[PDB]
Design an enzyme around this catalytic site. Structure first.
Site: not given
Ligand code: HEM
Ligand code: HEM
Ligand SMILES: Cc1cc(N)nc(CCc2cc(CCN)cc(F)c2F)c1
Ligand SMILES: Cc1cc(N)nc(CCc2cc(CCN)cc(F)c2F)c1
Ligand SMILES: C[C@H](O)[C@H](O)[C@H]1CNc2nc(N)[nH]c(=O)c2N1
Ligand SMILES: C[C@H](O)[C@H](O)[C@H]1CNc2nc(N)[nH]c(=O)c2N1
Ligand SMILES: [Cl-]
Ligand SMILES: [Cl-]
Ligand SMILES: [Gd]
Ligand SMILES: [Gd]
Ligand SMILES: [Zn+2]
Lengths: 401, 402
Positions: A105, A108
Site C-alpha cells: 500500500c 499508508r
Molecule cells: C486512503 C487512500 C489509499 C490509497 C491511495 C491506497 C492505494 C493503494 C494502492 C495503489 C495499492 C496497490 C495494490 C494493488 O494495486 O492491488 C494498495 C494496496 C493495498 N492497500 Fe492501500 N490505499 C489506500 C487506503 C488503504 C486502506 C484504508 C487500507 C486498509 C485499512 C489499505 C490496505 C491495502 C492493502 C491490504 C493493499 C494490498 C492489496 C493487494 O495487494 O491486492 N489501503 N493501496
C-alpha cells in the site's frame, strides 16, 4: 544484519531495524528472489500476547497496570474458550496497524486516520448488507471519501465463516459471448458468472455494477442488489479531447477490498472490507489499459490519431497518459477524492521518513509501491525498500469455494 | 520449484533453473532485499571450474565425452600446479555469452548468443589495452549499426595486479562540481571526472564532454587515454515536432559499453572485460536525462512544452518524459544509430523468457530492472512474475579500484 537501505536520488542511508520482527516468512531465499510474485492449538496465545504488548507500547503503557491486566483476561479468555475477543480500542488499533503494515500500500501516510466499524455482532447476510451499505455510504460520503473498514465477526472452529464473495464492493460485470471475448471487466468474469448462477439477471453493458454475494456462516451465498444511489461513479471525460466522453468510460468512486482476511493478535476476520480512495493509475493505467482488463489503450490511440503502426511512436505511452489525465480530471470535476501517482508516492516518501523515526523502518513492496506509469519519475523508484510481513496484517485468502 | 504466472495471458511455468543457483543473494524468508541496487581456496575454484566445463561440454553436445574428462583432468592438474587455470578460446566465447545470458537485469538478453568476443587476454600494458578498446568501440559502433561485443582482458591471477578500466563505461560525459555546489554535465560521473583531472586530464566545461579513459595495467597507476572524438559516435537530440527541443543542446552517445564489471567464468575472474550492445531509449530518455540526480531536464522540458507544472495532477512529468523518450528514438533513428524502444525490447524479452523456459527451465530476471522506468504496465514484462537468482558465468559488480 540490519539491512542498509539507500535512496539513490539523495544518497541518504537508513537501516531497517524493524525488519528484525518479521513474523510470517515470505517467499524468498538466499537462493532466489520471488519478490515479484503476486500471491507468494494454543499458539494463538503467542500472537495475542505480542499484539497486546504492541497496543500498550503504542499508548505509552508498556509494563504497567492494565497491560498486565489485559494480559490475564486474554490468558483466561483463551484458557476458557480457546479464543478471545478484542477490546474495542484494540480492534481499532489492529485495523490501523494492519494497514500500516501493508507493504504493497502506497497510501499508508493516511494509516492513522481510519474509521473502524465494529460489525462483530453480525448474524446473516442481510445484516452484513446494511453493515456494508453503511460503510459504503460513510466511506463514499458524496465523493469526499473517508477511509473505512468494517470488521465482521472473527472466525471460530466448528462454525462457518463470514465472507464477501466479490473481490471488491464495487465490481463491473464481465460477460463472454458466441466468441469468448469479454464485454465488461474481464477481471470479474468469474464472480459475474457466479452472480448469474445465484439468479442475477445479466445486464448488457460494459459497466454493469455487479450485485454482492454475501455469505453468513454455513449458509449458501445470498444475492444483494446495491442501491444505485449508493454506488457513486464517475463518467470519464477528458479536458481537451472532447470525444473521450463519447467512449462511455466510467469507474466507481470507492476502492473497497472485500476478499482479504484481517489478522489481529492471532484472530482471523475473513470478512473485513476496507476502503480508501483511488490513486489514479489504478484506474487509468491498470484497470482501463491492462491487456487483460478493459484494454482500451489502442482505442484511445485511434481516437488521438496516433501512429499505432510502430511501437517507437510511443502511442501506448501517450494514450495512457491521457487516460490517466481523464481519470484525474473526471474525478476532480465530480468532486470525488483521487490522488495522482506523483502526489501519492511523494506522500509515501514522507511516510517512510515518519516510519523510520517511529518504528525504525517500513515494510514496502517496491514492485507495488512504484506506480505502473512513469515509475522512475516518482521518488519511490529510487528508494530501496525492505519487504517483510508484520502483524497485524491484511492477508490474502482462498476464494470461499 | 517456484511457480511463475503471467498475469496478462494467464500463463504458468515453474522455474526449475533457479534450483541451480549456486551463489547466494540478499533475500531471506524473513525479508526481501530484491530492490537493493547492490546485493551480491583451490577446492572451490575447482568446483566452479568443474561446473562451467560441465556447462561448456553440455552446450557442445559432448557431455561426459572423452574430451570432457580430459578438460576436467587438465583443469585440476593446472589448479594443482599453478593455483589457477586458463580458458580455451571457445570456452571463453561461451563463458562471455553465458554471462550475458545469465545477467538478470538485462532486458536485451534475446541477443545473448549474438556476441562478438574479442580475446585480449594477451594484453600486456595499458597502451595495448587502449588499442584493444578503441578497436572494440570501432567494431561495436559500426557507424551506427551497433554490434554487441566484449573484450576480455587478462584474468586476475596470483602475483600481478588487476587490469582495470576505472571508467564505469567506455563513453561517459564529464560531471563537473560547480561553483555553486551544483553539477555541470552528468552528476553520475563526478568522481571519475575528478579522478581524470587529478591524473592530468585538462577538463572541459560543457555538459557533454566525453571523458578520457583511466586504464590500469597490473601493479600500475591508472593511465589516462583520450578517445579520438571520431571514435565516439554521438547523437544530437531533437524532437520530431517540438523544434525548440534541438535548442536544448542535448546529446547522447551511441555505444553503451560497461567497463567496470567483473566477468566470472568457471571461478576465473576478469576484472577488465568491457561489453557493449545498444541502448534502450528509456535508459537515455527517462533515466539518464530525467532522473533528478542526473541531467534532470524534466521540468525544463515541461516548461518549454507549456505544461502546467504547478500541479502534479496535470501529469506534466509524464507528458514531458514521454516526449523526451520520443525525441531520443527519433534522433537515433534519424542518425541511423541502433536503438530499441521499451515496448520492442520488453516484447523481445518475453520471447527470451519463452526460449529460456524451453532451453533451461526458467530465466533469472530482476523484475524491478526488467520493467521499464516509464509505462511499466504497458509493457508485457510488468505482468510476468520473475525469479531472480545468480547463475555463473556472470557479470558482477566490483569495488571501484580507487
Ligand atoms: C486512503 C487512500 C489509499 C490509497 C491511495 C491506497 C492505494 C493503494 C494502492 C495503489 C495499492 C496497490 C495494490 C494493488 O494495486 O492491488 C494498495 C494496496 C493495498 N492497500 Fe492501500 N490505499 C489506500 C487506503 C488503504 C486502506 C484504508 C487500507 C486498509 C485499512 C489499505 C490496505 C491495502 C492493502 C491490504 C493493499 C494490498 C492489496 C493487494 O495487494 O491486492 N489501503 N493501496
Ligand atoms: C544488445 C542490446 C542490449 C540491450 C537493448 C540491453 C539492455 C539493457 C538494459 C535496459 C539494462 C538495464 C540498465 C540499467 O538501467 O542499469 C541492461 C542491463 C545489463 N546488461 Fe544488457 N543490453 C544489451 C546488451 C548487453 C550485452 C552485449 C551485455 C554483455 C555481454 C549486457 C549485459 C548487461 C548487464 C550485466 C546488465 C546489468 C548491469 C547493470 O545494468 O547494472 N547487455 N541491459
Ligand atoms: C483500500 C484500497 C485503496 C486503493 N486505492 N487501492 C486498493 C487496492 C485495490 C486492489 C486492486 C487489485 C487489482 C490488482 N492489483 C487487487 C487487489 F487485491 C486490490 F486490493 C485498496
Ligand atoms: C551493454 C549494455 C547495453 C545497454 N543498453 N545498457 C546497459 C546498462 C548500462 C548501465 C547503466 C547504469 C545506470 C544506472 N542503472 C548502471 C549500470 F550498471 C549499467 F551497466 C549495458
Ligand atoms: C508480476 C508482477 O509482480 C505483478 O504484475 C504486480 C507488479 N506490481 C503491481 N503493483 C500494483 N500496484 N498492482 C499490481 O497488480 C501489481 N502487479
Ligand atoms: C532503488 C532501486 O532499486 C533503483 O532505483 C533501481 C530500480 N530499478 C532499476 N532498473 C533498471 N533497469 N535500472 C536501474 O538503474 C534501476 N534502478
Ligand atoms: Cl481497482
Ligand atoms: Cl547509460
Ligand atoms: Gd477525426
Ligand atoms: Gd512544432
Ligand atoms: Zn526477495
Amino acid at each position: 544484519k540490519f539491512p542498509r537501505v539507500k535512496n539513490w536520488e539523495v544518497g541518504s542511508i537508513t537501516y531497517d531495524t524493524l525488519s528484525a520482527q518479521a513474523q510470517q516468512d515470505g517467499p524468498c531465499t538466499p537462493r532466489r528472489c520471488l519478490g515479484s510474485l503476486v500471491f507468494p492449538p494454543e499458539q494463538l496465545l503467542s500472537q495475542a500476547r505480542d499484539f497486546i504488548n504492541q497496543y500498550y507500547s503504542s499508548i505509552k503503557r508498556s509494563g504497567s497496570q492494565a497491560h498486565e491486566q489485559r494480559l490475564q483476561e486474554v490468558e483466561a479468555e483463551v484458557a476458557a474458550t480457546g479464543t478471545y475477543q478484542l477490546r474495542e480500542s484494540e480492534l481499532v488499533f489492529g485495523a490501523k496497524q494492519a494497514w500500516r503494515n501493508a507493504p504493497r500500500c502506497v497510501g499508508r501516510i493516511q494509516w492513522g486516520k481510519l474509521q473502524v466499524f465494529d460489525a462483530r455482532d453480525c448474524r446473516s447476510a442481510q445484516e452484513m448488507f446494511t453493515y456494508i451499505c453503511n460503510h459504503i455510504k460513510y466511506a463514499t460520503n458524496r465523493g469526499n471519501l473517508r477511509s473505512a473498514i468494517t470488521v465482521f465477526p472473527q472466525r471460530c472452529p466448528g462454525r462457518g465463516d463470514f465472507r464477501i464473495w466479490n473481490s471488491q464492493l464495487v465490481r463491473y460485470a464481465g460477460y463472454r459471448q458466441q466468441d469468448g471475448s469479454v464485454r465488461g471487466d474481464p477481471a470479474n468474469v468469474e464472480i459475474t458468472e457466479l452472480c448469474i448462477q445465484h439468479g442475477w439477471t445479466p445486464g448488457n453493458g460494459r459497466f454493469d455494477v455487479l450485485p454482492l454475494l454475501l455469505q453468513a456462516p454455513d449458509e449458501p451465498p445470498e444475492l444483494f442488489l446495491l442501491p444505485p444511489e449508493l454506488v457513486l461513479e464517475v463518467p470519464l471525460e477528458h479536458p481537451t479531447l472532447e470525444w473521450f466522453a463519447a467512449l462511455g468510460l466510467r469507474w466507481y468512486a470507492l476502492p473497497a477490498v472485500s476478499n482479504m482476511l484481517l489478522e489481529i493478535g492471532g484472530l482471523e476476520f475473513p470478512a473485513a472490507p476496507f476502503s480508501g480512495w483511488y490513486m489514479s493509475t489504478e484506474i487509468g493505467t491498470r484497470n482501463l489499459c491492462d491487456p487483460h482488463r478493459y484494454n482500451i489503450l489502442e482505442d484511445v490511440a485511434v481516437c488521438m490519431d496516433l501512429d499505432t503502426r510502430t511501437t517507437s511512436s510511443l502511442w501506448k505511452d501517450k494514450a495512457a497518459v491521457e487516460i490517466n489525465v481523464a481519470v484525474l480530471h473526471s474525478y476532480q470535476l465530480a468532486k470525488v477524492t483521487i490522488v495522482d501517482h506523483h502526489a501519492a508516492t511523494a506522500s509515501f516518501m514522507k511516510h517512510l521518513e515518519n516510519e523510520q523515526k517511529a518504528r525504525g523502518g517500513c515494510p514496502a513492496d517496491w514492485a507495488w509501491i512504484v506506480p505502473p506509469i512513469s515509475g522512475s519519475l516518482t521518488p519511490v523508484f529510487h528508494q530501496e525498500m525492505v519487504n517483510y510481513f508484520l502483524s497485524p496484517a491484511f492477508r490474502y485468502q482462498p476464494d470461499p469455494w
